[PDB]
Symmetry: D2
Subunit: 267 residues, 4 copies
């Protein structure tokens, strides 16, 4: 297996469509011993994760909760056994109130909402790193889920801003991570039809935003030289695993594009 | 004059070393009729602005204050006279608590501090745009002060993250601004020895951070093909005015580097 | 005038639709004393340039001709009068054989053709700089015409490669230029319907390439927050003049986008 | 093994210090069945490649020779056996005459020399792709060796320009490659002390260029969060193999930085 004998912490599972669910599945297929972290609906995350190729301890983590982060390292160690450390940390956490995404005009998102979104979607990449780096082995790897925010786009609005902030956070996490011999990087993925994304397209955040995001998401497979199948997280999950492996040993504070090459193409 | 008959709102003056003080001065030398906005210490801002080539009404603006922003357009109109609009808006506002910059480890900045910093340094670019765009003329221009955050650097820490967020904000402000026939852009300046910057170099945010920033700032004049004089904001102030003028009519959601070309050079 | 008392060399005029014809016109409207350089069809360039707001000496320059480049400085001095130097140099020169652009598959362009294209479109930016920098004044400016090649696009093929090379050349010209106190920069313009571009759209380099370029060119005005009118070089010509002026004094080895902001927008 | 049952063509071996020698070695350690291509000194390349973990047929390829490229696919098929195709193609070919690199002023490189350099270092990435894509399997991979040319640097001069051109070429090769279900990407490596690089540092292309390149190369390990050991190609060779594998399935027309993260850091 690619990740044989590796202890990897995988955050972000909420449904069977979560990118993290596919990251977890592939890493287990590649021999990783995982520890999962869930938020709020833990009875659901447990039931969802029962479908993973193997059993993995589930720990609760609200990245906005300062006690959860402080108690994280200890709780992780209790699950993996004393004397054992993590080799991989996967941040697949993202959130933005409806004021920040969708139909709501960009100027109408109040700061308290944008702040909540940058805390969960960007600051938490450094929060997780702080907590987990003392219990990470040299050669270890932190991977975060990004969406290319280099250019503005319709509807994605403040969530775009949170991604720009996260790409900056990552470059700084890399500086700290490196002192522990650990790499920190992001995977900028093409659009993936998660339950939330599907709802949006179906008009959950308004019709105008839904049409904008359906058009936006169709432009990937057109630009992408090798195509883009938005109903398939496996190519994304495989890239995350390439970064958790020992095959990208000189890459840190960087972004790897699992987007079918669509970002390299104008038309 | 370059800005002849132009009504430009200039925010950010605090001392005679402020980049905004030099933006104000050059714009007045180029024939602009200005309206200034100050924060907290208004008796000081008035006394400092008495040294500008001409008189300009000073209005109070705490970008974190929702009433100031709501009352802004009306107060600006009262100063410029009803029936008159703004042609230019200058955002030269930035702030980050000491936990976010300096010696304090990157992981030790609490979110409430980083959030305060992203609100004042990034979100406020959209707050100002919202307020002022209804009272801006077609062909108008919004300019913001940026510091190239494309790569991580010592000590600048979370303020780097706030700049990355601001560059993203700008791309989105441009989308809204354009509906009013107004351009929105940033000027990524090289280091300028303001009173605050000088204090930092002198050890205000710790010795380690001071040495890092002195080294950092000396690398500009070495990389820069035309040199970089950090004791001179005039080249920066001139670039801001080029963007307020009618000579960059097809540039929006963009960054203009007034850094001596140092960003284009490795060594 | 913006360029009052400035002596600017303007290359690239071939027809009344040439970007250089509009650069020349605006610079003359802004008070510049110009020297023009033409290639091959000089009787035509003279007749075309008779329509400029003022008279300007026309000099012959085949950038592939080593004698023309060697004799350039002397011939320029003879036209502007001994003791006088240039303040501005405009490179608006570009060429790629049909094998390199259009319908012809990318793999089917022979090297001798691509080489001819990189010589005229990229290397010549350094050739012109070499020749003209000894007869340029401190504070002077070299400006070149670019087309954003950051991402691949249909039909533009090897001409894209020549632009990528030119952006690299510029960064290096800036290093040499700076020793003379002169800035070197490029203007990455949005598509302009020149006679050549119109012919292409009309099927001159094949129907498939024509349709690709018409689609490509229509995407500018859709992405561009302030719009993009491809039948109007005036916004481009104005930007070139902003770089020839004294209002961008700290910008070198850089690119300024006169594209309506379309490069900053995904959709 | 990572590359188990994969047939990979590896170009660029000249000495035991060649990046390609290490790409070959790692790919063989990971189970790849290789075909090597050499230039000019084939008796030497054979003797050097005798030290590879396994035997691999050596084929002659002067990328400037149109017959070699035409006969390539047939010769490769004869070596791997009819009915068998390539899964991987490694371009580790680069060259620039002394006029283009080193002490020689940037303006003093004649075009015939720069052209020779862009042909071998950039155009040949498309030449190899053309030749080998008809004999490549779906899921296949083309990898090229890049050196980050985003910013100008001392001494590297026209070779920088050739890299900028190659990054553009790659984005276009990706468009063609994709029709065959094949990915095309580059690895932008940090400096590697090959025999040629060592000679340069030792004054082979002049003392001024040698000092510039020694200083340049020392800046990597300082910027790089995880460090940079220039006497070790193994991290580079491992990254090339990650791209030849099935673990980066949604990455094409892209660049992967095996530079210790030094490009993500200012200081
Ligand atoms: N879906 C796409 O099109 C797409 C594309 C590229 C990147 N991404 C990114 O991938 C990541 C995963 O998103 P996804 O699309 O799989 O959706 P998702 O809904 O399945 O995952 C997001 C996760 O964030 C968790 N979360 C929210 N608030 C939290 C908090 N306070 N503390 C801890 N966890 C919290 C949720 O429980 C959920 O598990 C996100 O960063 C997203 O921005 C998504
Ligand atoms: N000094 C440098 O080296 C440098 C270089 C490039 C860019 N910049 C940027 O230029 C801008 C101006 O900075 P400066 O260096 O002239 O320093 P400065 O201290 O003179 O200006 C910053 C201004 O922000 C104002 N401000 C702070 N909090 C505010 C709030 N809540 N509401 C309204 N105004 C508020 C302050 O009153 C001050 O006038 C900033 O965005 C800064 O990041 C600075
Ligand atoms: N038209 C567009 O859509 C567009 C957009 C952005 C940038 N550009 C760039 O702007 C520049 C000017 O192009 P244009 O669109 O005005 O077309 P153009 O045909 O009017 O100008 C190109 C010029 O190159 C000259 N030239 C060709 N070979 C030469 C040689 N060997 N020596 C000297 N001069 C030579 C021609 O005489 C002509 O004057 C080019 O660099 C082009 O790539 C064009
Ligand atoms: N050494 C570094 O610091 C460094 C860093 C990053 C990238 N690179 C790149 O890696 C690649 C390999 O370089 P290297 O450093 O291992 O040096 P190298 O000398 O070992 O390899 C270059 C190869 O190019 C071959 N070659 C030259 N002309 C040729 C032609 N006409 N046809 C076919 N092959 C030809 C040579 O035989 C040699 O095998 C190059 O593209 C180089 O630019 C080098
Ligand atoms: O980042 C996300 N999607 C990327 C995207 C953007 C535009 C179009 N298509 C996809 N989604 C996240 C939003 C916050 C909750 C977790 C999921
Ligand atoms: O952005 C600022 N400085 C840029 C910089 C960074 C690193 C080195 N030298 C300069 N300063 C601002 C900080 C917040 C209060 C206003 C000023
Ligand atoms: O650079 C040029 N056009 C840019 C462009 C690309 C794609 C679509 N629309 C416009 N044209 C030049 C070609 C060589 C002769 C001079 C003109
Ligand atoms: O690309 C190469 N080196 C990268 C580099 C640049 C600057 C400093 N250190 C390293 N070298 C190649 C030159 C042409 C022959 C093959 C090797």
């Amino acid at each position: 297996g690619l990740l044989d004998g590796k202890r990897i912490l995988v955050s972000g599972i909420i449904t069977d469509s979560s990118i993290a669910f596919h990251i977890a599945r592939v890493a287990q297929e590649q021999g990783a011993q995982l520890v999962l972290t869930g938020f709020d609906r833990l009875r659901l995350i447990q039931r969802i994760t029962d479908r993973l190729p193997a059993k993995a301890p589930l720990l609760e983590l609200d990245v906005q909760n300062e006690e959860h982060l402080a108690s994280l390292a200890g709780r992780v160690t209790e699950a993996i056994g004393a004397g054992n450390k993590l080799d991989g940390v996967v941040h697949s956490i993202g959130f933005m109130p409806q004021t920040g995404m969708g139909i709501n005009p960009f100027f109408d998102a109040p700061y308290a909402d944008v702040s909540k979104g940058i805390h969960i979607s960007a600051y938490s990449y450094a929060s997780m790193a702080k907590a987990l780096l003392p219990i990470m082995n040299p050669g270890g790897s932190i991977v975060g889920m990004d969406f290319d925010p280099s250019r503005a786009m319709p509807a994605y609005n403040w969530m775009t801003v949170a991604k720009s902030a996260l790409e900056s956070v990552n470059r700084f996490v890399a500086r700290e991570a490196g002192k522990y011999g650990v790499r920190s990087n992001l995977v900028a993925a093409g659009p993936i039809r998660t339950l939330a994304m599907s709802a949006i397209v179906g008009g959950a955040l308004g019709e105008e935003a839904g049409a904008q995001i359906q058009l936006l998401e169709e432009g990937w497979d057109q630009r992408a030289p090798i195509g883009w199948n938005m109903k398939d997280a496996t190519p994304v999950a495989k890239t995350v695993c390439a970064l958790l492996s020992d095959w990208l040993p000189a890459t840190t504070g960087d972004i790897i594009y699992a987007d079918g090459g669509a970002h390299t193409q104008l038309l």
